[PDB]
Write a protein that holds these residues in place. Sequence first.
Motif, PDB file in Angstrom:
ATOM      1  N   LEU A 240       3.512  41.158 -13.189  1.00 33.74           N
ATOM      2  CA  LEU A 240       3.771  40.669 -11.802  1.00 33.74           C
ATOM      3  C   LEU A 240       4.131  39.180 -11.812  1.00 33.74           C
ATOM      4  CD1 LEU A 240       3.403  41.850  -8.923  1.00 33.74           C
ATOM      5  CD2 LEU A 240       3.262  43.282 -10.973  1.00 33.74           C
ATOM      6  N   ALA A 241       3.156  38.313 -11.928  1.00 32.88           N
ATOM      7  CA  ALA A 241       3.465  36.851 -11.941  1.00 32.88           C
ATOM      8  C   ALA A 241       4.701  36.591 -12.806  1.00 32.88           C
ATOM      9  CB  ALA A 241       2.231  36.172 -12.533  1.00 32.88           C
ATOM     10  N   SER A 242       4.957  37.438 -13.770  1.00 27.55           N
ATOM     11  CA  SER A 242       6.162  37.240 -14.619  1.00 27.55           C
ATOM     12  C   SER A 242       7.411  37.470 -13.768  1.00 27.55           C
ATOM     13  CB  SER A 242       6.066  38.291 -15.725  1.00 27.55           C
ATOM     14  OG  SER A 242       7.253  38.258 -16.507  1.00 27.55           O
ATOM     15  N   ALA A 243       7.813  38.701 -13.597  1.00 29.59           N
ATOM     16  CA  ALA A 243       9.018  38.971 -12.764  1.00 29.59           C
ATOM     17  C   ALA A 243       8.822  38.389 -11.360  1.00 29.59           C
ATOM     18  CB  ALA A 243       9.144  40.495 -12.700  1.00 29.59           C
ATOM     19  N   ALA A 244       7.680  38.612 -10.765  1.00 27.53           N
ATOM     20  CA  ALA A 244       7.439  38.068  -9.398  1.00 27.53           C
ATOM     21  C   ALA A 244       7.684  36.559  -9.381  1.00 27.53           C
ATOM     22  CB  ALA A 244       5.971  38.371  -9.090  1.00 27.53           C
ATOM     23  N   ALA A 245       7.067  35.837 -10.275  1.00 28.04           N
ATOM     24  CA  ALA A 245       7.272  34.364 -10.301  1.00 28.04           C
ATOM     25  C   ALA A 245       8.491  34.014 -11.150  1.00 28.04           C
ATOM     26  CB  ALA A 245       6.005  33.787 -10.911  1.00 28.04           C
ATOM     27  N   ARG A 246       9.311  34.981 -11.445  1.00 30.98           N
ATOM     28  CA  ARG A 246      10.546  34.705 -12.229  1.00 30.98           C
ATOM     29  C   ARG A 246      11.758  35.011 -11.345  1.00 30.98           C
ATOM     30  NH1 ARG A 246      12.527  33.746 -17.358  1.00 30.98           N
ATOM     31  NH2 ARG A 246      12.065  35.733 -18.330  1.00 30.98           N
ATOM     32  N   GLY A 247      11.506  35.385 -10.116  1.00 38.93           N
ATOM     33  CA  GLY A 247      12.609  35.703  -9.178  1.00 38.93           C
ATOM     34  C   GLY A 247      12.940  37.196  -9.290  1.00 38.93           C
ATOM     35  N   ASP A 248      12.451  37.840 -10.319  1.00 34.16           N
ATOM     36  CA  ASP A 248      12.723  39.297 -10.505  1.00 34.16           C
ATOM     37  C   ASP A 248      12.306  40.084  -9.262  1.00 34.16           C
ATOM     38  OD1 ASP A 248      12.051  37.657 -12.861  1.00 34.16           O
ATOM     39  OD2 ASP A 248      12.722  39.432 -13.882  1.00 34.16           O
ATOM     40  N   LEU A 249      13.235  40.393  -8.403  1.00 35.78           N
ATOM     41  CA  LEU A 249      12.886  41.164  -7.178  1.00 35.78           C
ATOM     42  C   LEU A 249      12.674  42.641  -7.524  1.00 35.78           C
ATOM     43  CD1 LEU A 249      12.702  42.113  -4.487  1.00 35.78           C
ATOM     44  CD2 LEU A 249      12.811  39.620  -4.609  1.00 35.78           C
ATOM     45  N   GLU A 250      13.692  43.292  -8.020  1.00 41.05           N
ATOM     46  CA  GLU A 250      13.557  44.735  -8.378  1.00 41.05           C
ATOM     47  C   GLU A 250      12.408  44.937  -9.366  1.00 41.05           C
ATOM     48  OE1 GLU A 250      17.062  46.307  -9.944  1.00 41.05           O
ATOM     49  OE2 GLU A 250      17.835  46.991  -8.053  1.00 41.05           O
ATOM     50  N   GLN A 251      12.337  44.134 -10.398  1.00 36.74           N
ATOM     51  CA  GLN A 251      11.230  44.298 -11.385  1.00 36.74           C
ATOM     52  C   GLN A 251       9.921  44.551 -10.640  1.00 36.74           C
ATOM     53  OE1 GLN A 251      11.344  41.933 -15.339  1.00 36.74           O
ATOM     54  NE2 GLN A 251      12.503  43.714 -14.837  1.00 36.74           N
TER      55      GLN A 251
ATOM     56  N   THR B 162       9.538  45.849  -7.576  1.00 33.85           N
ATOM     57  CA  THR B 162       9.631  47.223  -7.010  1.00 33.85           C
ATOM     58  C   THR B 162       9.323  48.252  -8.098  1.00 33.85           C
ATOM     59  OG1 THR B 162      11.293  46.500  -5.423  1.00 33.85           O
ATOM     60  CG2 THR B 162      11.354  48.805  -6.126  1.00 33.85           C
ATOM     61  N   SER B 163      10.148  48.322  -9.109  1.00 30.83           N
ATOM     62  CA  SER B 163       9.904  49.299 -10.204  1.00 30.83           C
ATOM     63  C   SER B 163       8.421  49.300 -10.586  1.00 30.83           C
ATOM     64  CB  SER B 163      10.760  48.808 -11.370  1.00 30.83           C
ATOM     65  OG  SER B 163      11.139  49.918 -12.175  1.00 30.83           O
ATOM     66  N   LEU B 164       7.856  48.144 -10.808  1.00 32.80           N
ATOM     67  CA  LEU B 164       6.412  48.078 -11.180  1.00 32.80           C
ATOM     68  C   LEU B 164       5.545  48.524 -10.005  1.00 32.80           C
ATOM     69  CD1 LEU B 164       7.468  46.343 -13.605  1.00 32.80           C
ATOM     70  CD2 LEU B 164       5.287  45.154 -13.337  1.00 32.80           C
ATOM     71  N   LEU B 165       5.920  48.169  -8.808  1.00 28.35           N
ATOM     72  CA  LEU B 165       5.116  48.578  -7.630  1.00 28.35           C
ATOM     73  C   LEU B 165       5.147  50.099  -7.487  1.00 28.35           C
ATOM     74  CD1 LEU B 165       4.347  45.898  -6.138  1.00 28.35           C
ATOM     75  CD2 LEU B 165       5.331  47.047  -4.151  1.00 28.35           C
ATOM     76  N   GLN B 166       6.317  50.672  -7.400  1.00 25.39           N
ATOM     77  CA  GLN B 166       6.404  52.154  -7.274  1.00 25.39           C
ATOM     78  C   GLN B 166       5.641  52.803  -8.431  1.00 25.39           C
ATOM     79  OE1 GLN B 166      10.178  53.032 -10.081  1.00 25.39           O
ATOM     80  NE2 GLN B 166      10.532  53.063  -7.928  1.00 25.39           N
ATOM     81  N   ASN B 167       5.442  52.077  -9.499  1.00 19.78           N
ATOM     82  CA  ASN B 167       4.692  52.640 -10.659  1.00 19.78           C
ATOM     83  C   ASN B 167       3.198  52.363 -10.486  1.00 19.78           C
ATOM     84  OD1 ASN B 167       5.352  53.515 -13.645  1.00 19.78           O
ATOM     85  ND2 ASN B 167       3.628  52.181 -13.714  1.00 19.78           N
ATOM     86  N   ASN B 168       2.803  51.120 -10.543  1.00 23.84           N
ATOM     87  CA  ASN B 168       1.355  50.795 -10.370  1.00 23.84           C
ATOM     88  C   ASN B 168       1.162  49.281 -10.381  1.00 23.84           C
ATOM     89  OD1 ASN B 168      -1.275  51.433 -10.151  1.00 23.84           O
ATOM     90  ND2 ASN B 168      -1.350  52.816 -11.837  1.00 23.84           N
ATOM     91  N   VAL B 169       0.320  48.769  -9.526  1.00 21.30           N
ATOM     92  CA  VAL B 169       0.128  47.295  -9.492  1.00 21.30           C
ATOM     93  C   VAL B 169      -1.162  46.903  -8.747  1.00 21.30           C
ATOM     94  CG1 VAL B 169       2.534  46.527  -9.590  1.00 21.30           C
ATOM     95  CG2 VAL B 169       1.704  47.727  -7.575  1.00 21.30           C
ATOM     96  N   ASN B 170      -2.013  46.114  -9.365  1.00 25.75           N
ATOM     97  CA  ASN B 170      -3.242  45.642  -8.655  1.00 25.75           C
ATOM     98  C   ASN B 170      -2.827  44.801  -7.445  1.00 25.75           C
ATOM     99  OD1 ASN B 170      -5.372  45.573 -11.455  1.00 25.75           O
ATOM    100  ND2 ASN B 170      -5.896  46.325  -9.472  1.00 25.75           N
ATOM    101  N   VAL B 171      -2.569  45.437  -6.329  1.00 29.87           N
ATOM    102  CA  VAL B 171      -2.135  44.687  -5.108  1.00 29.87           C
ATOM    103  C   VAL B 171      -2.877  43.350  -4.992  1.00 29.87           C
ATOM    104  CG1 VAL B 171      -3.636  45.121  -3.107  1.00 29.87           C
ATOM    105  CG2 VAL B 171      -1.211  45.709  -3.029  1.00 29.87           C
TER     106      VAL B 171
END
Length: 168
Positions: free
Chosen positions: A9-20, A22-31
């Motif tokens: 998360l902090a990686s793509a999320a804090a890297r500007g990775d928008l879709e990354q 999503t893909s991870l969210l639709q998969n699994n993510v500690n909200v």
Amino acid sequence: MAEPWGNELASAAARGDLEQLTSLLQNNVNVNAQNGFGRTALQVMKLGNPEIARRLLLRGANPDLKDRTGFAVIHDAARAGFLDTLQTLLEFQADVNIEDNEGNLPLHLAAKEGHLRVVEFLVKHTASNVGHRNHKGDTACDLARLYGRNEVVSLMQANGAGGATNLQ
């Protein structure tokens, strides 16, 4: 994979990775995950895009996800100048009153940086931080003021947010 939020998360999320996200969210993510850094992609989320957090906020991204300096992602959204991102926080009901590790809040930050149109948003919608006095009390008006930023001060001062409580 067994890595909810944090690096990915902090990686793509804090890297500007928008879709990354999503893909991870639709998969699994500690909200609400939070690496030892005490932060989650919702906090780092490349404020460049404000939907960054949104992608996480739609699943549950507490905009007041404070950090080590008591900085809420709202700080980041405004402190740097990401209103549309500061909006992702408001949209998702982000504590416009969220503060730092003492009292100052994301309205005083934009005030210290001079994010006028930005601090102008907190006074325009959200619950604004009119008398939101920090730890000592330099509210978001005693902040954009001490730093010189007046258009940021008048922004709140004029919007019944910079002290001046005279209604009679």
